[PDB]
Amino acid sequence: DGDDMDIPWCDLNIKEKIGAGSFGTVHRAEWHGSDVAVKILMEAERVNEFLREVAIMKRLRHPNIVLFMGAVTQPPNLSIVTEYLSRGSLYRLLHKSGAREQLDERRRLSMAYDVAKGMNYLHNRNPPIVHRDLKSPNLLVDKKYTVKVCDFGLSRLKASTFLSSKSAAGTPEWMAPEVLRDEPSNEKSDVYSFGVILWELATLQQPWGNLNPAQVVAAVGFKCKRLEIPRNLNPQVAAIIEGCWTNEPWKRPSFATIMDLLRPLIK
């Protein structure tokens, strides 16, 4: 056999750190001339869980998804190797230095189209795949400002009507109200998460940030609180955002539809 997606840890020359998380650290590294990003785990049934995130990334092949390039399968330094996006997360990008001049309206909307295209790809796998944690921080930017979806660790396969485990994980500021209430959810929960991301690209603001997880669960989850949309916002853009936030998940548009509404907004 051999799919050639197995990497020896000696073949990787680790470089400067680029991010941190509960799972472990992440560094930029050199791999046979190629520039890659390595996701090392903290030195547990999670070993079986790791193989899950690896087996699932191999099933993903789309231009708007972070390119999986292999993995180290030998402890203690397990790692997930992917391509390197030199512009970091869209989150840190939207709120850094001067982004008004760098990121004009057309560019920001385009970035949203990239996300929708990738998300649409996921929802159309067999079985479909729910990201369960779609947020600005989990979106990385290309040298040429192409946005790719990343961090599929909390991503589960949806073969049934709803999700199964009730793992109920994900960042509260971006999760859908039904998820915040810890009740049956589906692919429509991601659509809501996107609603927030579109809001960020459209208004250049940070969602909440004056509220802790508990306060978010309470407000947005059980008290029908939603992010404020400025009257100044493009009605067509606002319309797309409001659609993704509908209280009835089945009333929210699919990413396929979201693409159809965004395409004309560009140029």
265 part of the interface to a second copy, by CB under 8 A: no
Tell me whether residue 83 or residue 168 sits nearer to a second copy (CB atom): 83
**Residue 135 near residue 51 (C-beta atoms within 8 A):** no
32 part of the interface to a second copy, by CB under 8 A: yes
1 part of the interface to a second copy, by CB under 8 A: yes
Residue 25 marked ligand-binding? yes
**Site for a second copy (CB under 8 A): which residue of 25, 73, 77, 124?**
124
Catalytic site residue 142? no
Tell me whether residue 5 or residue 211 sits nearer to a second copy (CB atom): 5
- Number of residues in contact with a second copy under rule CB under 8 A: 30
Please give the angle made by the CA atoms of 37, 144 and 257, to the nearest 5 degrees.
95
Tell me whether residue 42 or residue 256 sits nearer to a second copy (CB atom): 256
**Site for a second copy (CB under 8 A): which residue of 121, 152, 199, 208?**
121
**Site for a second copy (CB under 8 A): which residue of 169, 204, 256, 266?**
256
Report the alpha-carbon distance of residue 228 to residue 252 in Å, rounded.
Answer: 18
Tell me whether residue 194 or residue 208 sits nearer to a second copy (CB atom): 194
Minimum Å gap between C-beta 176 and a second copy is 21
267 part of the interface to a second copy, by CB under 8 A: no
**Site for a second copy (CB under 8 A): which residue of 13, 17, 34, 49?**
34
Minimum Å gap between C-beta 102 and a second copy is 16
Minimum Å gap between C-beta 4 and a second copy is 4
Residue 39 marked ligand-binding? yes
* Candidate list 35, 114, 133, 182, residue with the active-site label: 133
Integer angstrom CA distances of residue 25 from 16, 67, 98, 149, 201: 11, 19, 28, 19, 28
**Site for a second copy (CB under 8 A): which residue of 22, 48, 97, 126?**
126
Mapping DSSP onto H, E and C, the string for the chain reads CCCCCECCHHHCEEEEEEEECCCCEEEEEEECCEEEEEEECCCCCHHHHHHHHHHHHCCCCCCCECCEEEEECCCCCCEEEEECCCCCEHHHHHCCCCCCCCCCHHHHHHHHHHHHHHHHHHHCCCCCEECCCCCHHHEEECCCCCEEECCCCCCEECCCCCCCCCCCCCCCCCCCHHHHCCCCCCCHHHHHHHHHHHHHHHHCCCCCCCCCHHHHHHHHHHCCCCCCCCCCCCHHHHHHHHHHCCCCHHHCCCHHHHHHHHHHHCC
Contacts with a second copy in 57-76 (CB under 8 A)? 58-59, 61-63, 67-70
Known binding residues for ATP are: 18-26, 39
**Which chain residues interact with a second copy by CB under 8 A?**
1-5, 32-34, 55, 58-59, 61-63, 67-70, 83, 117, 120-121, 124-126, 144, 146, 255-256, 259
Residues catalogued as catalytic: 133
